[PDB]
Amino acid sequence: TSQVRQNYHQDSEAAINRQINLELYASYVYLSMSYYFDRDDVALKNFAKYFLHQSHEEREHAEKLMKLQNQRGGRIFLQDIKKPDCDDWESGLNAMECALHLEKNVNQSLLELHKLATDKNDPHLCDFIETHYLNEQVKAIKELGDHVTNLRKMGAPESGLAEYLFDKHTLG
Amino acid sequence: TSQVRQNYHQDSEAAINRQINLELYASYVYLSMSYYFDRDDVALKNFAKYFLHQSHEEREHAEKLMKLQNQRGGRIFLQDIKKPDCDDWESGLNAMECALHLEKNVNQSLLELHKLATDKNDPHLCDFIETHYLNEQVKAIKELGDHVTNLRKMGAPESGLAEYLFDKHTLG
Amino acid sequence: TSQVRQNYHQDSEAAINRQINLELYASYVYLSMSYYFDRDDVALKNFAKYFLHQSHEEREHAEKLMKLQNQRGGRIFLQDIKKPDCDDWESGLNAMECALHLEKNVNQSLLELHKLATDKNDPHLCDFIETHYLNEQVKAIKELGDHVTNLRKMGAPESGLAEYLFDKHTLG
Amino acid sequence: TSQVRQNYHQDSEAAINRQINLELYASYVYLSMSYYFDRDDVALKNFAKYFLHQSHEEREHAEKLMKLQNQRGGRIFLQDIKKPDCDDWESGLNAMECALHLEKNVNQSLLELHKLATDKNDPHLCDFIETHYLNEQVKAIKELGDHVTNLRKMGAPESGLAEYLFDKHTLG
Ligand SMILES: [Cl-]
Ligand SMILES: [Cl-]
Ligand SMILES: [Cl-]
Ligand SMILES: [Cl-]
Ligand SMILES: [Cl-]
Ligand SMILES: [Cl-]
Ligand SMILES: [Cl-]
Ligand SMILES: [Cl-]
Ligand SMILES: [Cl-]
Ligand SMILES: [Cl-]
Ligand SMILES: [Cl-]
Ligand SMILES: [Cl-]
Ligand SMILES: [Cl-]
Ligand SMILES: [Cl-]
Ligand SMILES: [Cl-]
Ligand SMILES: [Cl-]
Ligand SMILES: [Cl-]
Ligand SMILES: [Cl-]
Ligand SMILES: [Cl-]
Ligand SMILES: [Cl-]
Ligand SMILES: [Cl-]
Ligand SMILES: [Cl-]
Ligand SMILES: [Cl-]
Ligand SMILES: [Cl-]
Ligand SMILES: [Cl-]
Ligand SMILES: [Cl-]
Ligand SMILES: [Cl-]
Ligand SMILES: [Cl-]
Ligand SMILES: [Cl-]
Ligand SMILES: [Fe+2]
Ligand SMILES: [Fe+2]
Ligand SMILES: [Fe+2]
Ligand SMILES: [Fe+2]
Ligand SMILES: [Fe+2]
Ligand SMILES: [Fe+2]
Ligand SMILES: [Fe+2]
Ligand SMILES: [Fe+2]
Ligand SMILES: [Fe+2]
Ligand SMILES: [Fe+2]
Ligand SMILES: [Fe+2]
Ligand SMILES: [Fe+2]
Ligand SMILES: [Fe+2]
Ligand SMILES: [Fe+2]
Ligand SMILES: [Fe+2]
Ligand SMILES: [Fe+2]
Ligand SMILES: [Mg+2]
Ligand SMILES: [Mg+2]
Ligand SMILES: [Mg+2]
Ligand SMILES: [Mg+2]
Ligand SMILES: [Mg+2]
Ligand SMILES: [Mg+2]
Ligand SMILES: [Mg+2]
Ligand SMILES: [Mg+2]
Ligand SMILES: [Mg+2]
Ligand SMILES: [Mg+2]
Ligand SMILES: [Mg+2]
Ligand SMILES: [Mg+2]
Ligand SMILES: [Mg+2]
Ligand SMILES: [Mg+2]
Numbered sequence: 001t002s003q004v005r006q007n008y009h010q011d012s013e014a015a016i017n018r019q020i021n022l023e024l025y026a027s028y029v030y031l032s033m034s035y036y037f038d039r040d041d042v043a044l045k046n047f048a049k050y051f052l053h054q055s056h057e058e059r060e061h062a063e064k065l066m067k068l069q070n071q072r073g074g075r076i077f078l079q080d081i082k083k084p085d086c087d088d089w090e091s092g093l094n095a096m097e098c099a100l101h102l103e104k105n106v107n108q109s110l111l112e113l114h115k116l117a118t119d120k121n122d123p124h125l126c127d128f129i130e131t132h133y134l135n136e137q138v139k140a141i142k143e144l145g146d147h148v149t150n151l152r153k154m155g156a157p158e159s160g161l162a163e164y165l166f167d168k169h170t171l172g
Numbered sequence: 173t174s175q176v177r178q179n180y181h182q183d184s185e186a187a188i189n190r191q192i193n194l195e196l197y198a199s200y201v202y203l204s205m206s207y208y209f210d211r212d213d214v215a216l217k218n219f220a221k222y223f224l225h226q227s228h229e230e231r232e233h234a235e236k237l238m239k240l241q242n243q244r245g246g247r248i249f250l251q252d253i254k255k256p257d258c259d260d261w262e263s264g265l266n267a268m269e270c271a272l273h274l275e276k277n278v279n280q281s282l283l284e285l286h287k288l289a290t291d292k293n294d295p296h297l298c299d300f301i302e303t304h305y306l307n308e309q310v311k312a313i314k315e316l317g318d319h320v321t322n323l324r325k326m327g328a329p330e331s332g333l334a335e336y337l338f339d340k341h342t343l344g
Numbered sequence: 345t346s347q348v349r350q351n352y353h354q355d356s357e358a359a360i361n362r363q364i365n366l367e368l369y370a371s372y373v374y375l376s377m378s379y380y381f382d383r384d385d386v387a388l389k390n391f392a393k394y395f396l397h398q399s400h401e402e403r404e405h406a407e408k409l410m411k412l413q414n415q416r417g418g419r420i421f422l423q424d425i426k427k428p429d430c431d432d433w434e435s436g437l438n439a440m441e442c443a444l445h446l447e448k449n450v451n452q453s454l455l456e457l458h459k460l461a462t463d464k465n466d467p468h469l470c471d472f473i474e475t476h477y478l479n480e481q482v483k484a485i486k487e488l489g490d491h492v493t494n495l496r497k498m499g500a501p502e503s504g505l506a507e508y509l510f511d512k513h514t515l516g
Numbered sequence: 517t518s519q520v521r522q523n524y525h526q527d528s529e530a531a532i533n534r535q536i537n538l539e540l541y542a543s544y545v546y547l548s549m550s551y552y553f554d555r556d557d558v559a560l561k562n563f564a565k566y567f568l569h570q571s572h573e574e575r576e577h578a579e580k581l582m583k584l585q586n587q588r589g590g591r592i593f594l595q596d597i598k599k600p601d602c603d604d605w606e607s608g609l610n611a612m613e614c615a616l617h618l619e620k621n622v623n624q625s626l627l628e629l630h631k632l633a634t635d636k637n638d639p640h641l642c643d644f645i646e647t648h649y650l651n652e653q654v655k656a657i658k659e660l661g662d663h664v665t666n667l668r669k670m671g672a673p674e675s676g677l678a679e680y681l682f683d684k685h686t687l688g
Contacts, residue, residue, distance in 0.1 A: 129467070134468045145215070176658055207411075242383050250372070252425065255424050298646070299647075
């Protein structure tokens with residue numbers, strides 16, 4: 001047993017390892033989306049920048065969970081990072097919709113993690129999740145919803161003008 | 173009788189109390205409009221900011237009338253602030269139209285207040301209304317008319333692109 | 345269903361709407377108290393300033409709950425803001441006592457809201473209440489208790505000198 | 517006839533001369549009050565400073581009316597400035613009460629002047645009175661009422677401590 005370990009259930013330790021993988025997966029999805037918008041036949045530079053920033057943020061989310069694992073005396077176990085579901089993301093609107101779906105999936109995992117921490121009476125872990133993750137997810141989901149709404153109202157994905165102007169005025 | 177009271181008719185005192193309620197009502201209407209534009213399925217952040225600013229301005233209008241009541245030796249009597257007529261404001265254009273209607277209603281009340289102050293030979297109160305309220309209303313009504321005109325010319329409310337671009341270029 | 349909504353119970357949504365009304369009510373109570381102290385026959389300018397600041401803070405409390413409702417995909421429903429229980433607040437001491445009672449009532453509502461969020465396993469909402477509301481209420485209640493104690497010890501409300509000096513030295 | 521005179525009734529001209537005398541009288545009253553508080557057996561230096569400032573303000577009020585008379589093509593006619601009603605002002609409270617009475621008398625004269633300007637259809641003169649005089653009087657009367665209230669609540673004039681502390685904390 002780690003000399004630092006206290007009130008940290010083996011199930012919580014395992015769940016933190018699963019969450020690390022999921023954050024790394026999210027980072028990879030956003031990386032793929034970013035460079036789709038950098039293609040010469042897509043060419044929306046602010047969509048590209050927005051998703052690259054999201055990719056780097058997800059890596060930070062993963063790193064903070066790795067730090068947490070060690071803080072509590074658990075042991076990090078890494079798994080393959082699966083490639084994203086798509087190679088071609090179709091449009092700005094479709095990428096935003098996929099990002100919304102992704103962030104809601106990550107949120108669901110965090111809520112399950114919090115339920116586990118609650119069941120194991122781990123208030124430090126509950127506070128960690130609430131402080132660093134739960135409101136971040138609510139904000140991310142709200143922002144993506146807002147973006148999807150605007151793109152739809154403007155006439156995307158059929159209107160290339162809509163996506164062009166959104167790229168300039170919202171993401172620029 | 174208040175030691176400060178001079179040339180201040182009981183009818184004017186009552187009318188000032190009614191105007192206080194109306195300004196607080198206007199503040200509440202604009203508060204409701206603001207957060208409508210903050211909904212994830214509406215998502216026009218500059219419409220939201222514009223109406224929130226208007227809400228706070230209306231509170232200032234109410235506070236200055238409360239100060240006036242006390243300056244003249246009248247006594248403030250508050251009433252319930254009625255909820256706004258709508259929960260859902262439909263569109264940027266419709267909210268602007270409702271705001272125009274509201275500001276013209278507030279103006280009519282101020283004009284009736286001025287008629288009363290004139291009838292009671294209260295030049296201090298006439299000057300107060302003219303200085304702090306009447307031109308403010310004319311400017312507010314002109315601005316809202318201008319906004320409604322632009323939104324109509326651009327193709328709102330049917331064009332979500334129109335409202336999006338107005339949000340960016342006029343309210344941004 | 346709102347595209348952003350996740351783990352947000354209809355009961356929690358309704359309770360947030362009730363809390364919005366209560367914060368707006370508190371704002372109105374403090375507004376009334378403020379201008380009582382601005383009367384020529386009361387004339388305690390720092391009591392007036394203190395309560396006006398509290399009024400504006402309560403509006404901020406309401407606005408943050410409106411933002412929360414939209415962040416979570418709920419829908420804001422507004423109700424009349426009831427007038428305060430009193431027109432005449434009697435004295436500095438009595439206003440402070442009424443403010444103490446008000447803040448404890450608001451705290452009780454927030455605690456009931458937290459119980460509901462707990463029962464519905466909504467850790468985001470629990471954290472929101474704890475972070476932005478619960479310690480604010482504890483601090484507000486402690487400050488008002490301190491004020492009431494000092495006013496009583498000094499000889500209020502019978503001593504107009506006590507209230508005068510408290511206005512200068514504590515609220516100034 | 518003065519080459520500048522236009523829409524300026526002889527009655528208005530005469531009334532402006534009477535108002536000039538009244539403002540000079542008010543200046544003299546405040547001068548007398550000021551030095552009462554400078555007596556070694558009274559010795560309230562901030563009461564003295566407050567009333568001296570009021571004395572100089574009243575002279576400014578007179579000078580602006582003299583300027584107005586010439587602006588409109590009327591001719592200034594000066595009369596004796598009567599000495600104040602009292603030599604001994606008794607107390608801080610009594611001086612404040614006499615100042616309140618004085619400012620209400622000056623206000624009544626200004627209201628009569630405005631009635632005359634209205635009857636003679638002189639909108640320039642009406643605006644002059646409203647802009648430079650009427651709200652100044654309302655503010656002055658409110659301030660003096662506030663002062664009287666505080667002094668009474670504190671226990672003046674019998675409490676020399678009350679007047680001492682008011683001198684320090686309100687007028688200091
Ligand atoms: Cl352990
Ligand atoms: Cl274990
Ligand atoms: Cl895994
Ligand atoms: Cl693996
Ligand atoms: Cl726990
Ligand atoms: Cl947000
Ligand atoms: Cl937030
Ligand atoms: Cl454009
Ligand atoms: Cl009156
Ligand atoms: Cl009357
Ligand atoms: Cl009313
Ligand atoms: Cl009512
Ligand atoms: Cl009049
Ligand atoms: Cl204008
Ligand atoms: Cl203008
Ligand atoms: Cl839900
Ligand atoms: Cl539900
Ligand atoms: Cl309610
Ligand atoms: Cl209602
Ligand atoms: Cl929970
Ligand atoms: Cl505290
Ligand atoms: Cl604290
Ligand atoms: Cl003439
Ligand atoms: Cl004439
Ligand atoms: Cl004379
Ligand atoms: Cl003479
Ligand atoms: Cl006229
Ligand atoms: Cl004032
Ligand atoms: Cl003023
Ligand atoms: Fe993210
Ligand atoms: Fe960031
Ligand atoms: Fe993440
Ligand atoms: Fe994320
Ligand atoms: Fe306005
Ligand atoms: Fe403004
Ligand atoms: Fe207004
Ligand atoms: Fe308005
Ligand atoms: Fe408060
Ligand atoms: Fe504050
Ligand atoms: Fe509050
Ligand atoms: Fe509060
Ligand atoms: Fe004066
Ligand atoms: Fe001055
Ligand atoms: Fe004067
Ligand atoms: Fe004066
Ligand atoms: Mg996984
Ligand atoms: Mg595979
Ligand atoms: Mg937080
Ligand atoms: Mg009304
Ligand atoms: Mg109703
Ligand atoms: Mg004017
Ligand atoms: Mg003006
Ligand atoms: Mg309620
Ligand atoms: Mg009622
Ligand atoms: Mg905290
Ligand atoms: Mg005279
Ligand atoms: Mg004589
Ligand atoms: Mg006029
Ligand atoms: Mg003015």
